[PDB]
From a paper:
We were able to successfully purify the enzymatic domain of DslA by omitting the lipobox and ~35 aa region of low complexity/disorder, fusing region R74-K254 to maltose-binding protein (later cleaved). This construct yielded two independent crystal forms, diffracting to 1.26 and 1.36 Å resolution. Attempts to solve these via molecular replacement with “conventional” lysozyme structures failed, indicating potential divergence from the superfamily fold.Table. All four of our DslA structures (two wild-type, E143Q, E154Q) are highly similar, other than a relatively small flexation of the β1–2 hairpin in the E154Q variant. The secondary structure elements create a classical two-lobed architecture, with helix E and β1–2 sat below a pronounced active-site cleft (measuring ~25 Å across, ~15 Å deep). Partial activity for HEWL against the GlcNAc-deacetylase-treated material was indicative of our in vitro prior deacetylation of E. coli PG not running to completion, and illustrative of the difficulties of reconstituting B. bacteriovorus activities in vitro outside of the bdelloplast. Despite this, DslA was clearly inactive against native, acetylated peptidoglycan, but displayed strong activity against the deacetylated material; this level of activity was on a similar scale to that of HEWL and mutanolysin with their known substrates. Of the six saccharide rings, GlcNAc “c” and “e” sit with the 2′-NAc groups facing inward. These two positions are occupied in DslA by Y228 and M150, the former placing the sidechain OH in the same position as an acetyl oxygen. Hence, specificity of DslA for GlcN over GlcNAc presumably arises via steric blockage of ring c and e if the sugar groups are acetylated.
Here, we discover a family of Bdellovibrio proteins that define a new subgrouping of the lysozyme superfamily and demonstrate that they possess outright specificity for deacetylated peptidoglycan. We solve the structure of family member Bd0314 (that we named DslA), revealing adaptations to the lysozyme fold that sterically restrict the active-site cleft into only accepting polymers deacetylated at the GlcNAc positions. We determine a role for DslA in B. bacteriovorus exit from the prey cell and demonstrate that exogenously added enzyme is able to prematurely liberate predators from prey bdelloplasts before completion of the predatory lifecycle. The architecture of DslA is related to, but significantly different from, other members of the lysozyme superfamily but still fulfil the inclusion criteria for the lysozyme superfamily noted by Monzingo et al. — conservation of the β-sheet floor and helices D and F, with appropriate placement of acidic catalytic residues.
Residue numbers in the entry: 73 to 254
The structure:
């Protein structure tokens, strides 16, 4: 039985299916994510190195749900025009649960064929897993600005970037107080 349940099961009707999808997608798209022992575990999840494979999947589903909370408040339809440009000089449009954009997302191999695909919560969450799989495993840590460079998921998502703000503070607090982490 699960020890940790993601926050979207509290908020959205389809949240249990989102979890089912994320556990599957972590197996397939997050194998490197699930092998990292992150250097900032003392902040995010003090007992991380003791977690089983299944527990690490529960952990990452929960953290993803806390990112979704502050990126989109669980609104898969969300579409937000940013103040920075894509490769054509057009304003980037961030989409869906994790506020991913189509050009940047597809660079990770997410294979969005239409902008509408980013509003499919399952495709959106899969892409988030690909992004984490790349940076958390490359950088060996979940977040943080280290020696002048943002690391891990903080490379992509503002809510993972340390600052005196509700999103980051909540994500860290909720993570480190998970029973499996504490």
């Amino acid at each position: 039985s699960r020890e940790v349940i993601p926050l979207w099961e509290d908020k959205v009707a389809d949240g249990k299916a989102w979890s089912t999808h994320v556990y599957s997608a972590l197996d397939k798209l997050g194998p490197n994510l699930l092998d990292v022992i992150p250097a900032d575990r003392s902040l995010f999840c003090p007992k991380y190195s003791s977690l089983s494979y299944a527990q690490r999947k529960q952990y990452w589903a929960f953290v993803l749900s806390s990112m979704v909370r502050f990126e989109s408040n669980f609104k898969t339809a969300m579409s937000y025009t940013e103040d920075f440009n894509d490769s054509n000089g057009n304003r980037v449009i961030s989409r869906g649960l994790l506020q991913i954009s189509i050009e940047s997302g597809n660079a990770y191999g997410c294979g969005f064929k239409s902008t509408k695909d980013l509003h499919d919560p399952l495709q959106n969450l899969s892409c988030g897993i690909r992004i984490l799989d790349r940076w958390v495993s490359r950088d060996g840590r979940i977040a943080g600005k280290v020696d002048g460079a943002w690391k891990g998921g903080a490379r992509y998502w503002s809510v993972l970037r340390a600052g005196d703000k509700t999103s980051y503070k909540s994500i860290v607090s909720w993570s480190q107080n998970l029973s499996i982490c504490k």
